[PDB]
Design a binder for these strands. Structure first.
Length: 56
DNA sequence: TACACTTATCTACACTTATCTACACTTATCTACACTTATCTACACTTATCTACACTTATCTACACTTATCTACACTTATCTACACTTATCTACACTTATCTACACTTATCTACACTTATC
């Protein structure tokens, strides 16, 4: 995720419209979806592929 | 420069104060858990936006009449050439003043020599 990467390089989950401002729950849902992608799943599990392994 | 006396700088040594480590108690920070409010989705009603259709006004074309623009023609005035007379410009010639060279006298500049003061 770019969110945690100070150089901004990575991926992000975003609202579609550039003009919208995200609601209080939407900002958290977007962070959850990012985390889900990183973990490739709901829970953390070292036995599962990371997103890096998936992409490779 | 050379020489002597005393003061300032530097080293060595002992005592107490400041800095640092180790140990115990309570407060601040963090996690876990339950309740209620704010955010979001789904659904129904009326208002605003958009399309289609008819009527009259503004825009555009076509046509005739007179005014302004343009050409052609004649008369006098301004511009240009040619010609004669006197004034300004230029050359040639003589006289005196300013510039330049040569010559003598005294003053300023430079060298040499002795005594004391500053520097060492």
């Amino acid at each position: 995720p770019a969110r945690y990467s100070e150089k901004g390089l990575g991926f992000e989950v975003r609202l579609r419209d550039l003009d919208a401002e995200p609601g209080r729950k939407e900002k958290e849902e977007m962070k959850r979806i990012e985390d889900f992608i990183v973990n490739t799943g709901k829970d953390k599990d070292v036995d599962r592929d990371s997103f890096q392994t998936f992409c490779k």
